[PDB]
Design a protein around this ligand. Sequence first.
Ligand SMILES: C[S@+](CC[C@H](N)C(=O)[O-])C[C@H]1O[C@@H](n2cnc3c(N)ncnc32)[C@H](O)[C@@H]1O
Ligand SMILES: N#Cc1cccc(O)c1
Ligand SMILES: [Zn+2]
Ligand SMILES: [Zn+2]
Ligand SMILES: [Zn+2]
Length: 426
Amino acid sequence: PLKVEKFATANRGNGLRAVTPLRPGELLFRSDPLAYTVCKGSRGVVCDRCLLGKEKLMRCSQCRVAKYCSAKCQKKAWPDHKRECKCLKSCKPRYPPDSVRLLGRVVFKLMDGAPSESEKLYSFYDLESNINKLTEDRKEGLRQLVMTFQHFMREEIQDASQLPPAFDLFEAFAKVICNSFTICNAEMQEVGVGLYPSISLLNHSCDPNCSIVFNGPHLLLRAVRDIEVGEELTICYLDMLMTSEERRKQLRDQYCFECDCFRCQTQDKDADMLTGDEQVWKEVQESLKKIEELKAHWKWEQVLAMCQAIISSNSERLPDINIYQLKVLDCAMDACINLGLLEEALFYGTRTMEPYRIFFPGSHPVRGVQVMKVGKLQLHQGMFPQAMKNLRLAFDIMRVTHGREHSLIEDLILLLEECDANIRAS
Ligand SMILES: C[S@+](CC[C@H](N)C(=O)[O-])C[C@H]1O[C@@H](n2cnc3c(N)ncnc32)[C@H](O)[C@@H]1O
Ligand SMILES: N#Cc1cccc(O)c1
Ligand SMILES: [Zn+2]
Ligand SMILES: [Zn+2]
Ligand SMILES: [Zn+2]
């Protein structure tokens, strides 16, 4: 018996609403993707199948593009990789955009696979395309994606008989633009992109009552507020560390809608987000383009060097609640963790705690994970009371946002037991 149902909203298309009253942390839906792939930066860093990092990956001998953590993952991926393999090989030096690789996997799944549980509430066929809102500039981009698909897939798809009935590639890419999910690993690093058509029923809110989290390719949808029967379920499509102007741009450009919510009408938190000297944070925002590029390719040493040049600059500095400063601190802490510089990681991480408390209100998985990471750093430096407080806080959040079905919660419980044991040993 489902706790959610599809319905026709008054002014934002189809949506999902509660069938029964829901409490924070209640599991509402879970789904594997219809189709997913590793993203450009994590290609060859994480396993194509399970999206976990490993020191060495095994490559597919035939295409040498797909890479895997284990023989089990390589073999189990074979059915869904078989047809793209021939295409990735035939186009050997060229690598397609992620959306093109994703849509290839959609087509093969729809042509060769049994009906997917991911489409139980809503199918790829049903997805919103927003075609009558696309700008001419966007349409031109989609035409180029279509031609890119036709080139990449030419070994496996020659005509319409090899596409689902009445399948339109331009419409399909339009659906991909406004319905793709960015898959994050346990550490909240972006590692892949997928389609989850049932989950695509959820409309957006800048102050949502539900949240999604990924455990490998697997998606869990949870309530993060009390929700009444009949109330619409929402998730935030966007990074919380964004101004209302930045949210406006991305919701127009990617999703073709204007947000009417209280936060957007009042520029909620914008002023605090942009405190400090404008010329400094405009420079930091510009530098974050390359820092975030380097991070997406797991280039931690280079990330750290650019972040240290800002955090410990000889020139003017920003407050930690400035969102561009905060992003830099977070990149620096993740780089330090991955480099084993744990004292320095804790320094940056602790500095993010109060800004994260402000910018991730309620129960948000990004804050839960950040608090977990800080507590773990404190635990292994022997700061047991402080670690315990943060690990408990991480559990208060993550019991709502991750829940027992998520493997990270088991890791957190272990840290809680370890820290508690240390406190009892006195
Ligand atoms: C396809 S998904 C969500 C489900 C969608 N309403 C549908 O009918 O399939 C994303 C799209 O939903 C719409 N949408 C999502 N959140 C919205 C919001 N807060 N206000 C208006 N439209 C929204 C926009 O068309 C957006 O591109
Ligand atoms: N290859 C390729 C390609 C096709 C469309 C857009 C783009 O950025 C790249
Ligand atoms: Zn694997
Ligand atoms: Zn291959
Ligand atoms: Zn809004």
